[PDB]
Amino acid sequence: DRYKSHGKGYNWGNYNTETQKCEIFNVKPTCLINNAAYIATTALSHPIEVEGNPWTEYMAKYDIEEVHGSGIRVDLGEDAEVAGTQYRLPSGKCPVFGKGIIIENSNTAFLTPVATGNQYLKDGGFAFPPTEPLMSPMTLDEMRHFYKDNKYVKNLDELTLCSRHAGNMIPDNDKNSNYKYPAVYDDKDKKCHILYIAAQENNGPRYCNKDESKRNSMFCFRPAKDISFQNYAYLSKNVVDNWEKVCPRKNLQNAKFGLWVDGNCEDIPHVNEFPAIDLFECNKLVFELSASDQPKQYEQHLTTQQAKDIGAGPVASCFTTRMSPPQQICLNSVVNTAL
Numbered sequence: 051d052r053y054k055s056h057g058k059g060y061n062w063g064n065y066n067t068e069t070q071k072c073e074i075f076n077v078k079p080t081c082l083i084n085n086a087a088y089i090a091t092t093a094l095s096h097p098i099e100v101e102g103n104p105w106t107e108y109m110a111k112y113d114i115e116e117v118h119g120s121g122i123r124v125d126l127g128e129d130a131e132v133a134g135t136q137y138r139l140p141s142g143k144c145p146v147f148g149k150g151i152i153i154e155n156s157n158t159a160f161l162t163p164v165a166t167g168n169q170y171l172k173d174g175g176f177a178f179p180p181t182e183p184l185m186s187p188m189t190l191d192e193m194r195h196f197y198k199d200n201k202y203v204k205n206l207d208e209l210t211l212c213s214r215h216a217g218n219m220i221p222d223n224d225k226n227s228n229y230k231y232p233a234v235y236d237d238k239d240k241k242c243h244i245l246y247i248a249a250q251e252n253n254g255p256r257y258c259n260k261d262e263s264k265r266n267s268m269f270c271f272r273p274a275k276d277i278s279f280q281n282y283a284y285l286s287k288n289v290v291d292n293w294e295k296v297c298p299r300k301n302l303q304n305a306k307f308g309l310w311v312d313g314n315c316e317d318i319p320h321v322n323e324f325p326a327i328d329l330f331e332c333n334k335l336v337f338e339l340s341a342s343d344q345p346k347q348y349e350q351h352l353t354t355q356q357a358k359d360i361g362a363g364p365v366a367s368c369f370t371t372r373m374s375p376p377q378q379i380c381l382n383s384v385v386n387t388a389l
Contacts, residue, residue, distance in 0.1 A: 053349070053359065054127055057115035057142075059341030061122060064306045064318070065089045065332040072332035073321040074339055078113045079307035081105040081315035088306040089329055092298045093122045093340030096147040097275050097333035101300040103310045111298050112307070114341070118144040118297070121343035123273050124250045125286055130228035132221060132364045138343075139248055139361075140232040140286035144297035145209050149337070150234070150279035151176060151250055154270040155260040161187075161234060164246045166383040170265030176247040178219075178231070180382045181369075185219060186244035193242060200373055206291055209235050212242035213289040218373055219244065221366035229364065230287035238281040246385070249361035251344050257356055266388045275334040301329060362389075 064073040068087045080103060082090065089100060092112060111117055120127030120142035127141035151160040158175050165174030178186035188196065190208050193215055197203045203214050216233035234243045250273045252258045258270035290296065308315040322339075326332040350356045368380040 053343050053345045055121045055341040055343050056127065057118050057120055057122075057341050059093075059122070060322070060336065060339035061093045061114045061341055062112065062307055063091050063332055063336040064321070065091055065326065065329050067329070070325055070327055072324045072326040072335050073318070074324060074336055075307075075318050075321045077309075077318075078109075078115065079309065079318070080109055081308045081310040082109075082302065083306040083308045083315050083317070084304060085306045086304050088304065089332075090302040090305045090307045091329065091333050091336060093333075093337045094118060094144050094146055095298045095301050095333060097280060097330045097337075099300045100303045100329070102313070105310055105315075111296055118142045119288075120286070120341070122146055122149075122340040123337055123342040124344040125232075125284075126248075126250075126343040126361050127286075128288075130224075130230070131226060132224045132229050135358075135364070137229060137248075137358065137361075137363055139230065140250075140284075141288050142286045143288050143290045144293055145235075145289055145299075146284040147299060148275040148279050148282060148333070149273055149284040150276060150282050151271050152274050152276060154253075154258075154272070155262065156269060160271070161236075161243045164389065165386040166381065169386060171267070171386045171388040172262065172265045172269050174386070176245050177234075178244040178246045179385065181379050182382060183379065185215075185379060187241045188215065190240040190242070197373070203373065207294065208237075208240070209283055209285055209293065210289055210291045213285045213287060214373075215242055216244040216285070217287045218371050219369040219379065220372055221364055222368045222370065223364055223366065227372060231363075232287065233285045235283045235285060236281055237283070246363075247361075247389075248363050252360055254347055254350055254356075257350065257360075266386070268388070273337075275330075275337045277330070280330075301333070365389075
């Protein structure tokens with residue numbers, strides 16, 4: 051459990067729109083200060099959208115350690131036993147708005163299906179390859195029809211439903227049904243993408259290769275809030291069904307995070323200042339600095355299972371469903387062995 055952040059990190063920022071300063075800090079805020087120059091943001095928040103302690107109830111959703119409970123930039127907060135081997139999995143309770151993965155020196159978008167059949171590893175992305183019946187990608191309307199006879203899921207919010215759908219595929223080696231894949235929901239196309247690869251960062255020169263001529267070598271990649279990801283939500287298996295009320299999403303206009311002390315909201319007494327031209331660029335920096343469950347580079351050298359420690363998952367070609375009716379679903383083609 052050495053790598054788990056449990057949500058601790060530089061998760062919050064006060065963006066001064068007039069001085070173009072992103073004031074980043076790593077303690078939970080406990081009140082808000084009215085100030086027309088400011089917008090209050092968190093690493094989980096959408097990067098653009100804006101809206102004896104009397105603040106306790108209102109500020110609960112900014113207590114990231116309590117309401118999310120895991121990393122943000124890299125979320126690998128739980129372990130799942132499969133056939134005697136313990137794999138790392140995303141486990142945060144809130145959706146991460148605007149997060150995606152950039153594959154370095156690559157044309158491949160990360161929601162492209164993982165390489166299968168005759169494809170080289172670097173030709174494919176992170177998403178589930180086609181299955182029969184087709185499980186991913188699936189649109190919202192398709193998901194509600196798929197689950198139309200399941201009372202407990204059919205009416206879930208679209209993000210919670212995408213999370214539960216991604217969790218509806220049990221690898222056939224996983225007899226205790228512990229392993230649940232993460233997912234990305236694209237609000238533009240209203241599509242749920244189950245992610246076959248649960249890793250989110252691989253940047254060590256000893257463990258990845260950025261050369262495009264070595265197309266079966268492991269590629270390098272990192273999480274980011276790129277402008278092209280603004281409609282995505284990165285979702286672990288644990289996304290809660292009431293995230294809309296308990297998790298952050300919109301940024302707070304005309305508001306500065308503060309700390310409640312002796313009946314008054316005081317300024318955060320020490321912040322780390324980064325320049326940022328607009329709110330999106332501040333949110334991107336807060337995310338870059340936020341809680342991470344990634345092993346530090348020196349820790350990846352000291353382990354004998356570097357791939358597992360960054361989230362490498364089990365080899366699975368056929369699956370069974372968790373929710374009724376029980377059915378078997380197989381990939382149309384097996385994933386590239388290089389994985």
